[PDB]
Amino acid sequence: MAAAAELSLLEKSLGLSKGNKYSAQGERQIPVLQTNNGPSLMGLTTIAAHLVKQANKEYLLGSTAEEKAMVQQWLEYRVTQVDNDIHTLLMDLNSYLEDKVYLTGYNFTLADILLYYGLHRFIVDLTVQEKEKYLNVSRWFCHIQHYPGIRQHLSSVVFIKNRL
């Protein structure tokens, strides 16, 4: 039931008090939200973008047409690529992140939150040497894990920072 719990997490990180109920749909257990407006909404990234707008935090979806397309890109990556396989994923992500603090390039967006929640599973299990192998992933993940209100109940992963 992981996706419903993850959308519950995001509700809390977005500072939304009214916890929604989610069902599942299909052999792949895709999340479903009935809304009060009220069209019914299905899929992690579709619901998450809905939740952002009602938290009055639409900047998390990006601020220019280019940043929006980048947020869209990284949302699609979460549901298609994240959701031994992971070591190949992590290496490519490590290279991508070498020159960036945030996933979409410049600013903190929903794409960082959802990728952080999606990888958390795998990052908790990396050895010390593996965290040192993927330095850029570790650096980004540590920054999001400390970012105000995001981690909530997730375990902190231990990252030791040089000369600190």
Can you put this structure into words, describing what you see?
The chain is 52% helix and 7% strand. The chain is mainly α and 164 residues long. Strands 1-2-3 form a three-stranded antiparallel β-sheet, with helices on one face. Helix 1 (2-13) runs parallel beside helix 2, helix 3 runs parallel beside helix 5 (110-123) and helix 5 (110-123) crosses helix 7. It is found in: Cytoplasm; Cytoplasm, Cytosol; Nucleus. Residues 64-147 are annotated as: C-terminal.
Question: Which short descriptors sum up this protein?
Answer:
globular; 3 strands; Glutaredoxin; aminoacyl-TRNA synthetase; 164 residues; GST; 7% strand; mainly alpha; protein biosynthesis; Glutathione S-transferase Yfyf (Class Pi), Chain A, domain 2; 2 domains; rna binding protein; P18; 7 helices; 3-stranded antiparallel β-sheet
Task: Summarize it.
The chain has seven helices and three strands.
The tally of domains stands at 2
CATH architecture of the largest domain: Up-down Bundle
Highest-level CATH class of the largest domain: Mainly Alpha
> Judging from the principal axes of the Cα atoms, what is the shape?
globular
- Give the DSSP E fraction (strand runs of 2 or more residues): 5-15%
Calculate Rg over CA atoms: 16 Å
How many individual β-strands?
A: 3
Which structural class fits the helix and strand makeup?
mainly alpha
Multimeric state? monomer
Which fold name is given in CATH as the topology of the largest domain?
Glutathione S-transferase Yfyf (Class Pi), Chain A, domain 2
Estimated helix fraction: 40-55%
Strand order of the largest sheet: 1-2-3
Please count the helical segments: 7
Series of H and E elements: HEEEHHHHHH
Major sheet characteristics = 3 strands, antiparallel
Cα end-to-end separation: 39 Å
Region (Linker): 57-63
Domain GST C-terminal: 50-164
Subcellular location: Cytoplasm; Cytoplasm, Cytosol; Nucleus
Modified residues (N-acetylalanine): 2
